[PDB]
């Protein structure tokens, strides 16, 4: 495993260990998002704003329907066969999304048999259930605003103001919509489109959608904020101006024999100067295989690191040896900033750079001094039952590692500069050194 | 200092000099954000949407309260002793934030003595002042929407529609809230959470919060947009569904003998080709020490660069020598983009790549020609009182540097490619060159 003692001497104090779990096995529910409100109760005070809105929304939704019927007409049952000659160019994800789209078309047709009922909806959330075959939920984009504000104010304000307000609400809805459903949606076939983005067709109210679908669980927020709950547009209507979206609700399957180890970057002292070690702060270990993880795209939770797909990335052999004990191969960067972490706590044991912070022991009153040959000091109850570092007073546990931690020095790694301009500078210097040697 | 003449010949025309100032010495005000509106005036038809909202909000807020009582029960007076054995794993910032939390608990209890008054609030902004001990402001998340829209429309619409509107408003509030207070808030103990993020518990209205607190000053916008005004959740109520937040309002102290120098990247000519210099455009010089600055996280203002943290990062010795005069160590990248800056103005003196743009002088009518051995041309009133650069006609001052600027050539640095794929390609080539040499 990782050599946590030498890493802590380097300033990589080990943190909490988190489970590795990935989105898997998605269950499908189909919903209807009607992108035009019902203005039947205020039709006499509507004007031509609805026709302009219909034209604009048709222009927006026509490319989406075209991209869908790229895969509708080129995919058929056989048990799902595509004419890849007609499709021409596609990726694996896009082809799998086309399979999912063709699988969803049967329920899309079952829903489209309720086209008139979808058109007749006059509430923001309407459940359509004629038989067990057709049990869909319809969400209307601006119906609540109509029924709450504009209809009660028909007799209170001049109806030209009502028309202007309806036009402004529709245009604001289109402004919020175009960030997601505009030309940014080049590939509506893909099912990686999250439910937050699709909720922009409902004014950004994904909470209403998912609470109505009945997804309230303890892992619901984890699936929500890890971008695991995604949806796919499976049908676009250019006459009634609604879309049918297949919402994919997955389960978080834990990756077995896998864990993410977090390292806390404590600055350490060397050569009368302060350094921080340039290592990955999160290390994914699966089947004792040490590798990097793109944890920026993953949700980090106290129990687990939650990802919507496997973000494991390769790691150099030099960093793997750094993490397994070869501290001489660990790059270090100078500390010019005065706000980088000076100390950290792990298992009740404090690892501090007491050159930079005034460590002193409350039990004895003596200052905890660090020598020039010590990168950090391990402070535990054997040497200091209660340590004080400025404004904090902390009681400490006992270190489970070597009792000679503070007397056992280690080899140190090469200095680095991680700024991208300085990265180009070092590449220039190494290239010129190679040319001089050659 | 920096050798601005050679840098300008390289195309790094010096810009404005800005002070370095950092957030320091925060003053604390405690506020209450009641996360559930008072629906008493429409209680006869709120339905069960309020109980569902309470269940959802309790599920959201329970992890936050648990994370707080991790540090409530493990911190006590000594004079603030913390039980590091029970906490186990923590960072310096997290421990300091827990100490600040325990410091704020006394005012949290003083406020919680007004629990019934907080529950009884029926306005979006309510000032609670029984005695001088308890002078807290309470902000209610959706109270204004209730009092303005739903209560007046009780008799105007069938208030089942009012129930639906209330449910939709609460769900939209939760949708806006979950981006900040959901599982993304893994560490609510930290006090680095900005007031913009906390205002999402008030619907994103941080202006109301900070105007009500009376933080109106000339530096208020600078503190706001530099993420210097931050708050810390100090108490969570799972029965009345409110939080007590300690808002930290700091002062922007100036870093003495420190300044950030901006360089304007003018493209320059060499070998019948156009180049830009790969140097940091902002250089932080503190006590004559030249270093990089992560200015992406800081607010840049005409007077100063404003930071919530010391974002100074180290600089390579080669780049420091580039900035101090060694132009042969300055990396340069080819120009393929036809939209990179061709010229710039500094102190009324124009530094232009007249190979790429048609420089000409209005005073004499003669075109300002650049030779193949010149990287740029310095255009000043000694050689051209008024220069023309197409649609731009500009009057120019006198250069304070060398009078032989245009006749004194310089050494040029190595070409580079800064694309990350090209970075991997150059690392591949240097590694293979090393293996061939070895």
């Amino acid at each position, epitope marked *: 495993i990782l050599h946590y003692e030498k890493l802590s001497k380097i300033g990589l104090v080990k*943190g*909490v*260990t*988190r*489970k590795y779990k990935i989105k898997s*096995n998605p*269950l499908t529910k189909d919903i209807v998002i009607k992108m035009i409100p019902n203005v039947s109760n205020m039709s006499q005070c509507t004007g031509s704003v609805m026709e302009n809105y219909k034209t604009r929304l048709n222009g927006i939704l026509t490319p989406i329907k075209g991209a869908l019927e790229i895969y509708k007409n080129n995919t058929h049952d056989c048990g799902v066969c595509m004419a890849g000659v007609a499709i021409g160019i596609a990726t694996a994800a896009q082809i799998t999304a086309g399979v999912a789209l063709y699988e969803a078309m049967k329920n899309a047709d079952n829903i489209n048999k309720l086209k008139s009922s979808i058109e007749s909806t006059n509430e923001a959330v309407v459940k359509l259930q004629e038989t067990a075959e057709k049990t869909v939920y319809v969400f209307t984009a601006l119906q609540d605003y109509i029924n709450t504000n504009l209809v009660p104010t028909i007799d209170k304000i001049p109806c030209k103001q009502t028309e202007l307000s309806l036009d402004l609400a529709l245009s604001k809805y289109l402004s919020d919509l175009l960030f997601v459903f505009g030309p940014n949606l080049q590939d509506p076939v893909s099912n990686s489109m999250t439910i937050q983005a699709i909720s922009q067709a409902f004014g950004g109210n994904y909470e209403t959608l998912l609470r109505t679908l*009945g*997804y309230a*669980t*303890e*892992d619901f927020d984890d699936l929500l904020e890890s971008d695991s709950i995604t949806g796919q547009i499976i049908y676009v209507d250019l006459s009634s101006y609604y879309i049918i979206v297949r919402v994919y*609700f997955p*389960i978080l*399957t*834990e990756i*077995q*024999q896998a*864990y993410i180890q977090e390292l806390l970057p404590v600055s350490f002292n060397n050569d009368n100067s302060e350094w921080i070690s340039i290592v990955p702060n999160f290390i994914l270990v699966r089947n004792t295989l040490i590798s990097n993880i793109e944890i920026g795209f993953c949700l980090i939770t*106290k*129990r*687990s690191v939650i990802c919507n797909q496997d973000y494991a990335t390769p790691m150099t052999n030099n960093m793997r040896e750094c993490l397994t004990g070869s501290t001489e191969k660990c790059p270090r960067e100078l500390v010019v900033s005065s706000h980088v972490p000076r100390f950290a706590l792990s298992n*009740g044991v404090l690892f501090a750079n007491c050159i930079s912070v005034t460590c002193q022991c409350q039990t004895t009153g003596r200052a905890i001094s660090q020598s020039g040959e010590q990168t950090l000091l391990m402070i535990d109850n054997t040497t200091c039952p209660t340590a004080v570092l400025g404004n904090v007073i902390i009681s400490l*546990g006992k270190y489970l590692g070597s009792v000679n931690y503070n007397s056992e020095g280690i080899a140190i790694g090469p200095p680095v500069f991680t700024d991208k301009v300085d990265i180009s500078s070092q590449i220039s210097s190494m290239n010129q050194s190679l040319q001089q040697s050659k | 200092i920096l050798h601005y003449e050679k840098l300008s010949k390289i195309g790094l025309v010096k810009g404005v000099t800005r002070k370095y100032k950092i957030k320091s010495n925060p003053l604390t005000k405690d506020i209450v954000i009641k996360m559930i509106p008072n629906v008493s005036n429409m209680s006869q038809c709120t339905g069960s949407v309020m109980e569902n909202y309470k269940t959802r909000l309790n599920g959201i807020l*329970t*992890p936050i*309260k*648990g*994370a*707080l*009582e*991790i540090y*409530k*029960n493990n911190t006590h007076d000594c004079g603030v002793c913390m039980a590091g*054995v*029970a*906490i*186990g*794993i923590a960072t310096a910032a997290q421990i300091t934030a827990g100490v600040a939390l325990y410091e704020a608990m006394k005012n949290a209890d003083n406020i919680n003595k007004l629990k019934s008054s907080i529950e009884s609030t029926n306005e979006a902004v309510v000032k609670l002042q029984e005695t001088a001990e308890k002078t807290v402001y309470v902000f209610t998340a959706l109270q204004d929407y209730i009092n303005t829209n739903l209560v007046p429309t009780i008799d105007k619409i069938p208030c089942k529609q009012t129930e639906l509107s209330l449910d939709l408003a609460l769900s939209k509030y939760l949708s806006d809230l979950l981006f900040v207070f959901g599982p993304n808030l893994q560490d609510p103990v930290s006090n680095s959470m900005t007031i913009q993020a906390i205002s999402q518990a008030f619907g994103g209205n941080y202006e109301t919060l900070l105007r009500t607190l009376g933080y109106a000053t000339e530096d208020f916008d600078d503190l706001l947009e530099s993420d210097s005004i931050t708050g810390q959740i100090i108490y969570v109520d799972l029965s009345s569904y409110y939080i007590i937040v300690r808002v930290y309002f700091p002062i922007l102290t100036e870093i003495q003998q420190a300044y950030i120098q901006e360089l304007l990247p003018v493209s320059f000519n060499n070998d019948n080709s156009e180049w830009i210099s790969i140097v940091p455009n902002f250089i932080l010089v503190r006590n004559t020490l030249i270093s990089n600055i992560e200015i992406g996280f800081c607010l840049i203002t005409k007077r100063s660069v404003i930071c919530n943290q010391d974002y100074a990062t180290p600089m390579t010795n080669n780049m420091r020598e580039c900035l101090t005069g060694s132009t042969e160590k300055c990396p340069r990248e080819l120009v393929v983009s036809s939209h990179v800056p061709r010229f710039a103005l500094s102190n009324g003196v124009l530094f232009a790549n007249c190979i790429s743009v048609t420089c000409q002088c209005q005073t004499t009518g003669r075109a300002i020609s650049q030779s193949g051995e010149q990287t740029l041309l310095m255009i000043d009133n000694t050689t051209c009182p008024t220069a023309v650069l197409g649609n731009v006609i500009i009057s120019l001052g006198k250069y304070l540097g060398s009078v032989n600027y245009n006749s004194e050539g310089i050494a040029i640095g190595p070409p580079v490619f800064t694309d990350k794929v090209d970075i991997s390609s150059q690392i591949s080539s240097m590694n293979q060159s090393l293996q061939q040499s070895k």
Partner: antibody
Amino acid sequence: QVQLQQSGAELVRPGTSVKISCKASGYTFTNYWLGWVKQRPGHGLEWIGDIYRGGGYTNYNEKFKGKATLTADTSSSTAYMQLSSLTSEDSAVYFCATRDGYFDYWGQGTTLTVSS
Amino acid sequence: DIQMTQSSSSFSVSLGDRTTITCKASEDIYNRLAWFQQKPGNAPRLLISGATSLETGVPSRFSGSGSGKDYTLSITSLQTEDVATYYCQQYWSSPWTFGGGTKLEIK
């Protein structure tokens, strides 16, 4: 290798309280849920409550809320279940088990017998 | 609370024959199911996590499946070590509920 070592079987008089312990050892992950499950003869498994060794809160079954009290000691990784006002129907085998939704690793079980 | 009901308190299946244990939830739990095997005198051991995913130590003869409210644990070839009580646990809603327990027996 994960082991959840529980306290031995207890013979407790009615009306008094018992405090069953469960020391989790060998668990890789720092923060986890730890649930308590009751198993009576003639009855299925009955979940009592979950203690969260990560965030400082706990879930209780509404049947067992107030009856049971879950506490945890993060230093020794030992959690406790205080059962108060024991009666004859409280005699059961009690299992501590880490869970991630599903109960993953189970303790060997503490047989509690309430009789006079 | 989600009531978890198993088909029978006990089944008698001959050795080598396929054994089917079914569990019905009161409401849709969306594959948030677990299957546990408990021999007498021992703690339950996890067989299936989710509807279908096997535990790494479980033999491949244990197969989990299910949709909606109905779920099924299948033993393709019953052995003498599989004679135990099988419990279905739901972990969809906050009160975690187990099944009635299916005490498997040999004819």
